[PDB]
Amino acid sequence: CTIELKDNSNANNPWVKYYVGALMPTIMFGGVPIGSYKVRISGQISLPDGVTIDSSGYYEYPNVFEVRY
Amino acid sequence: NFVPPAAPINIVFKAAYDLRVQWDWNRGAGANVREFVLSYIDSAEFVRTGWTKAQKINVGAAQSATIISFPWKVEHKFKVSSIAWGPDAQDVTDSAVQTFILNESTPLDNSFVNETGIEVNYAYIKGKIKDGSTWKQTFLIDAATGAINIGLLDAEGKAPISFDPVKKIVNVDGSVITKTINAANFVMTNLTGQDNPAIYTQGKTWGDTKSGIWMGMDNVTAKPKLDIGNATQYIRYDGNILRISSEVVIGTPNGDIDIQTGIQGKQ
Amino acid sequence: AQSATIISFPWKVEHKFKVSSIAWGPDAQDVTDSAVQTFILNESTPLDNSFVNETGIEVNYAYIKGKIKDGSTWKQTFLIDAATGAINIGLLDAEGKAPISFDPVKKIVNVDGSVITKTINAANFVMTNLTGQDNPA
Question: Contact B171/B147 with Cβ under 8 angstroms?
Answer: no
Question: Contact B20/B69 with Cβ under 8 angstroms?
Answer: no
Distance in angstroms (rounded) separating the CA atoms of residues B225 and B234: 13
Angle C1-B37-C113 from CA coordinates, rounded to 5°: 45
Question: Contact C18/C33 with Cβ under 8 angstroms?
Answer: yes
Check B221 against A30: CB less than 8 A apart: yes
| Method used to solve the structure | cryo-EM
- H or E segment at A12? none
Chain C adjacent subunits, 3+ CB pairs under 8 A: B
Q: Nearest Cα to B163, choosing from B174, B144, B147, B141?
A: B147
Q: Which residues contact B210 (CB under 8 A, 6 or more apart)?
A: B201, B203, B204, B230, B231
Answer whether B22 touches C (CB < 8 Å).
no
Residue of B nearest to A30 (CA): B220
Check B61 against C105: CB less than 8 A apart: yes
Distance in angstroms (rounded) separating the CA atoms of residues B204 and B198: 11
For residue B89, report the phi and psi dihedrals to the nearest 5 degrees.
-60, -45
CB count within 10 Å of CB C62 equals 23
- H or E segment at B113? helix B111-115
How far apart are the CA of B162 and the nearest CA of chain C, in angstroms?
10
Residue of B nearest to A24 (CA): B240
Identity of the residue in A29, A34, A69 whose CB atom sits nearest the CB atom of B222: A29
Check B68 against C58: CB less than 8 A apart: yes
Q: Nearest Cα to B137, choosing from B172, B162, B164, B174?
A: B162
